Ligand binder design. Structure first.
Ligand SMILES: *C(=O)[C@H](Cc1cnc[nH]1)NC[C@@H]1C[C@H]2CCCC[C@@H]2CN1C(=O)CCNc1ccccc1
Length: 300
């Protein structure tokens, strides 16, 4: 019993973290086989950042402009190239701790584990959701660029996020491991806004199932609804529409608890319309939207 934010074990990813320095900037990189990936902004000076022409900045650099350190071992840079908003540095040593891995582009609403690193050194691990507005609500400080987000399936690490920046609102923006930003952002030091966020309805419902699996039942009722009248109320409270595909995804949880999806939906409508009246669900007064159905099943 019990239900916690739970990250994947981070060892496989820890063995890939290195330190990358260019001039006086030090930030993290990811060392897979004979390649190190890091934010290309590592090459910018204070002035360059404002309005960088990265192709111009990079052609001016050479292999010895980059220092890569793996623990206290220097790795020799023998090649460099641009990979959208990442640099790809080729090193003379293949990482012997390279796990089975792939690069995935995470979708809105999906979760991943973040390994926050400073100076090439892992510092903490936590779960985050890709927000509908293509930001993550992380916890990152200066020096954390290059920190990665990942999931694990069996043996295989699926890297999905590399951290670039914090927006003014205090949320975070970064790239996939092909170097393409999530969302409308650019790697310039200018104020950028994200779109208006919305709540991840599928995840809220999953969490409500988790609550029931853990014995929190007060918010259940016998009121029911159709998918359409649920959606009308969702829209009013800035919740994502719920689709039949989403309903289907909740099938196993629904079968496990004996609570039909639309009946839980009726439970959520009531929670949205009248609040909680001083009570908690899994210890929270907030409707939690960063556990997916999969995170619920895997844990409960
Ligand atoms: C990187 O580690 C940091 C991540 C962070 C900070 N708080 C939470 N996460 N982001 C660095 C930040 C943003 C990027 C955006 C793209 C262009 C470069 C820009 C550099 N950033 C700075 O804060 C720069 C601060 N001054 C500075 C000047 C010269 C060289 C390095 C840094």
């Amino acid at each position: 019993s019990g239900f916690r934010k739970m990250a994947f074990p981070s060892g496989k990813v820890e063995g890939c973290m290195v330190q990358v320095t260019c001039g006086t900037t030090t930030l993290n990189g990811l060392w897979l086989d004979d390649t190190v990936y890091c934010p290309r902004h590592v090459i910018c000076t204070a002035e360059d950042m404002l309005n960088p022409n990265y192709e111009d900045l990079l052609i001016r650099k050479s292999n010895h402009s980059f220092l890569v350190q793996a623990g206290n071992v220097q790795l020799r840079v023998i090649g460099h190239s641009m990979q959208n908003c990442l640099l790809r540095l080729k090193v003379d040593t293949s990482n012997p701790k390279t796990p089975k891995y792939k690069f995935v582009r995470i979708q809105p609403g999906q979760t991943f584990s973040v390994l926050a690193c400073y100076n090439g050194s892992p510092s903490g691990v936590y779960q985050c959701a890709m927000r509908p507005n293509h930001t993550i609500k992380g916890s990152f400080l200066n020096g954390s660029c290059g920190s990665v987000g990942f999931n694990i399936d069996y043996d295989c690490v699926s890297f999905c996020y590399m951290h670039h920046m914090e927006l003014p609102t205090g949320v975070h923006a970064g790239t996939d491991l092909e170097g393409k930003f999530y969302g409308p952002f650019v790697d310039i030091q200018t104020a950028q806004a994200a779109g208006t966020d919305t709540t991840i309805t599928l995840n809220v419902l999953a969490w409500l199932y988790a609550a029931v699996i853990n014995g929190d039942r007060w918010f259940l009722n016998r009121f029911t609804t159709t998918l359409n009248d649920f959606n009308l109320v969702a829209m009013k409270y800035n919740y994502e529409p719920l689709t039949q595909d989403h309903v289907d995804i909740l099938g196993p949880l629904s079968a496990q608890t004996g609570i039909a999806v639309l009946d839980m939906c009726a439970a959520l409508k009531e929670l949205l319309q009248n609040g909680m009246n001083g009570r908690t669900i899994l210890g929270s007064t907030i409707l939690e939207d960063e556990f997916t159905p999969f995170d619920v099943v895997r844990q409960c």
